Structures are given as structure tokens and as C-alpha cells.
């Protein structure tokens, strides 16, 4: 068996993998490794397809979707959630702390605040500019 091992999507996976590997190489759990791996990209405002710096919807709202699945069919999911930089971690909170597996929209944000996540402005200057430029075309 070839283990531990992590795979991730796109070129930005390569640096995300290095973060995941800090957990996996020390014998840590796959769930912790994938969360930390993807949070790196969530946090990065220069990666504009994930998390902070995300290109907005047509109304200028940055809305994020995420889900997580562990080794025993535990799942959590958020969708269309605004203002929280680490949706993967809210998803993990939906999984671990509620009787539900998916929260969306304002409900998802309410829940996130109840768990201590911090409300933030995820629309960067660069994404705002490009959005206003798109409104022109």
C-alpha cells in the first residue's frame, strides 16, 4: 500500500499538498490534513476561485460552497455562505456539531457565527475591480 498519500486539484494543489503533508507525515488524520490543505487556498486572496478573494456573483457578493467527508460516512456541507473565510471548517462544524449535514445561505452564516467564526469582508479590491469591469462588458 502506498500511504500516506494526498491528491488535490489544479496547480495550486501542489502547495496545498505541502500543508496537508505536514499533518500526514506525522501520522495525523486524513480529515485534519485535507482541512488544513484546503484552508491554505481559502486564506489566499490571490487564488480567486476559492475563499477570500473569490470572484463574486453577478451582484458583487462573494458566496462560498464547501463540503467535507471523513472515513465513516460523516459529512458536512455549506452552500452560498457569505462573510466567512473558511467554509470548509464551517462544513466540518455542521458535520460534528449539528444533526444536519447541509446548511445554506443566511442559516449557514448564523451557524458559523454561533461557532465563533468571524465575519469578514471577502471581496478584495482586485475582485471588486474585475467585477465592475465585467458589469461593463
Amino acid at each position: 500500500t502506498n500511504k500516506p498519500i494526498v491528491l488535490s486539484t489544479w496547480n495550486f494543489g501542489l502547495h496545498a499538498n505541502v500543508e496537508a503533508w505536514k499533518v500526514l507525515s506525522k501520522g495525523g488524520k486524513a480529515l485534519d490534513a485535507v482541512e488544513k490543505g484546503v484552508r491554505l487556498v481559502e486564506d489566499d486572496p490571490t487564488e480567486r476561485s476559492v475563499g477570500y478573494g473569490g470572484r463574486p456573483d453577478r451582484d458583487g457578493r462573494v458566496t462560498l460552497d464547501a463540503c467535507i467527508m471523513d472515513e465513516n460516512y460523516n459529512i458536512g456541507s455549506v452552500a452560498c455562505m457569505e462573510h466567512i473565510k473558511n467554509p470548509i471548517s464551517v462544513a466540518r462544524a455542521v458535520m460534528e456539531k449539528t444533526p444536519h449535514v447541509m446548511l445554506v445561505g443566511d442559516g449557514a452564516l448564523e451557524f458559523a457565527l454561533s461557532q465563533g467564526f468571524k465575519k469578514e469582508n471577502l471581496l478584495t479590491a482586485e475582485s471588486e475591480k474585475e467585477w465592475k469591469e465585467w458589469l461593463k462588458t
Binding site: P4, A33, S49, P56, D65, M69, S77, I88
Partner: protein, 144 residues
């Protein structure tokens, strides 16, 4: 979107998917990233898979659940990803759409740590880290 799937030193699988979604989507649009079976699926007795491409098309075909059931039925991760893309290509044709307008692909891992990937179109790479190191790998694609 980033999706990530891992097999740990205990031999357990887990996965995560996170996105900002399609740029300039309609307010409230959801793609495949939060949908279990579409953007991500993990079964610790079989394997895990996560999806890339147009969200609407991953949703439509429930693609990661398909890839994992193909592994369940004896396909390697590479074989499963390829077969799932080939069935999706047939569906795109049945739909009368142009394959050039549709990207779907998958990455997959099994319980032995075998892995693989496949996509409709070129231009996608995945990253893989194991004890030999971290590598950027480029899978095959159907649209040639």
C-alpha cells in the same frame, strides 16, 4: 475550486471540497462542491474521488459517486475516472451539446493508495504527494 482527498498512515480516507463558485453566477447559484456524490465522495472500504469542471455538469451526472462505484466494481482509480468521463461524454452527446463547451474530470484514490485522474478536456493537472515526494501530474483526456 480546490478538492483534496487523502489516505492517512492508519489507512483511512477523507476528503474536502471548497469553492467560490462560477464567477458572476446568478445570486444563490450552487455548483457541485458542496454536494456529496457530485463534488466529493469517500467510502473507506473502497476509495475516494473529487471533481473538477463546470459545476452544473458534475451535479448532473453525480460523478464522484459514479467513480467510487466503478472502483467498487473492480476498476483501478485511473480506469474508474476514465470510464466515468466516457459515460459523461455519451451523456453530453445525447444532450446535443458541444463537448468543447463542457469540462468534467475527476481525481481518485483507492484503499491501496493507487490513484488516477481523467478529464473531458486538456488543461487540468493534479498534485500528488506521497513518501516519494510531491508531483504535478497531467492526466489523459477524451477530447482529442
Amino acid at each position: 475550486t480546490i478538492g483534496m482527498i487523502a489516505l492517512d498512515a492508519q489507512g483511512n480516507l477523507s476528503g474536502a471540497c471548497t469553492t467560490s463558485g462560477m464567477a458572476y453566477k446568478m445570486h444563490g447559484r450552487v455548483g457541485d462542491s458542496p454536494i456529496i456524490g457530485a463534488g466529493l465522495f469517500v467510502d473507506n472500504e473502497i476509495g475516494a474521488a473529487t471533481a473538477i469542471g463546470h459545476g452544473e455538469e458534475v451535479i448532473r451526472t453525480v460523478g464522484t459517486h459514479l467513480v467510487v462505484e466503478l472502483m467498487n466494481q473492480g476498476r483501478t482509480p485511473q480506469q474508474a475516472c476514465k470510464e466515468a468521463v466516457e459515460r459523461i461524454v455519451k451523456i453530453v452527446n445525447r444532450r446535443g451539446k458541444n463537448l468543447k463547451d463542457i469540462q468534467v474530470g475527476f481525481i481518485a484514490l483507492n484503499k491501496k493508495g493507487e490513484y488516477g485522474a481523467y478529464c473531458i478536456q486538456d488543461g487540468f493537472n493534479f498534485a500528488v504527494h506521497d513518501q516519494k515526494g510531491n508531483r504535478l501530474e497531467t492526466p489523459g483526456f477524451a477530447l482529442k
